Amino acid sequence: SGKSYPTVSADYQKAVEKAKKKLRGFIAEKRCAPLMLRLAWHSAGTFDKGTKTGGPFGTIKHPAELAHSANNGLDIAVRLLEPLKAEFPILSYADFYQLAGVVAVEVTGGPEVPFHPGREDKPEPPPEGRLPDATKGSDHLRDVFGKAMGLTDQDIVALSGGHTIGAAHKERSGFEGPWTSNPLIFDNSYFTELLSGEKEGLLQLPSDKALLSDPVFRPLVDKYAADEDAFFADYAEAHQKLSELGFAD
Ligand code: HEM
Numbered sequence: 001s002g003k004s005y006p007t008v009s010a011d012y013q014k015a016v017e018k019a020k021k022k023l024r025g026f027i028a029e030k031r032c033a034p035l036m037l038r039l040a041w042h043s044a045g046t047f048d049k050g051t052k053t054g055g056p057f058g059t060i061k062h063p064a065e066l067a068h069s070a071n072n073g074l075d076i077a078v079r080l081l082e083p084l085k086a087e088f089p090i091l092s093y094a095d096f097y098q099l100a101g102v103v104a105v106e107v108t109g110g111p112e113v114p115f116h117p118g119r120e121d122k123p124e125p126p127p128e129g130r131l132p133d134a135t136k137g138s139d140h141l142r143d144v145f146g147k148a149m150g151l152t153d154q155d156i157v158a159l160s161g162g163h164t165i166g167a168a169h170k171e172r173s174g175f176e177g178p179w180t181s182n183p184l185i186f187d188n189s190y191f192t193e194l195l196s197g198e199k200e201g202l203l204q205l206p207s208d209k210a211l212l213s214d215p216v217f218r219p220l221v222d223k224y225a226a227d228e229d230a231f232f233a234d235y236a237e238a239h240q241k242l243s244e245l246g247f248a249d
């Protein structure tokens, strides 16, 4: 929607296809899908529509951006991918990381998020502080996803469902544990667990709980808890948009 994707060479397209396969096997074996989804989303989620700065242009590999507190632990993800990236010198880091995020969702059983190549790596990381704060609520979520990224309220709730895989770590954010009973399985359980309340061994952030009390977010939580197909459709739409912020406009 509103996108005009660039032309890339046949050899570039060949590399995308081969890298997709290599990433599947690597991410599945290493059990790092959630960390790779977090990497891709943290790279993309810095987009500010007003200034057209940040976004999915490969800058998350820069030591300066990895040092942002919201990126605690993503240095591990960058290191894990570097040997594989080196097998695909023709690819931009931006394309590679966004492809890794799409693959992370696929190999855990989630929707097939469309992918288009051609992002060009940008020289300078954006300023720290654009990623969302786990202790804040719905006004903050709309500031970050809406006023900065330019995504919709539907996209906020669907993308929050990325917590359906993975966990927090007390040494990284300070929060601790998985949102779901099957942290390597991508399904609608994040919403089921959010709605059933606190269960021992499972995590809810204040930012997750904010979805339950908001008049626009709550009907979406309910929809996704009742209808995984609907969640998968809206998730794929939102993740594609996120992965393409500032790209091919
Ligand atoms: C809605 C606002 C969000 C907030 C406040 C938030 C906050 C957090 C926090 C505090 C952690 C734990 C980090 C750690 O301690 O390891 C985390 C992890 C994670 N986030 Fe988010 N997040 C948000 C949105 C998203 C989005 C949009 C996605 C992707 C679609 C996402 C994907 C993930 C994943 C997969 C993990 C698990 C990482 C792992 O298992 O190592 N999050 N998030």
Ligand SMILES: O=C(NO)c1ccccc1O
Residues within 6 Å of the ligand: 038, 069, 070, 071, 131, 132, 133, 134, 172, 173
């Ligand atoms: O990993 C995160 N989000 O996915 C995250 C981690 C720490 C602080 C804020 C955040 O948004």
Ligand code: NA
Residues within 6 Å of the ligand: 164, 165, 166, 180, 181, 182, 183, 184, 185, 186, 187, 189
């Ligand atoms: Na899960």
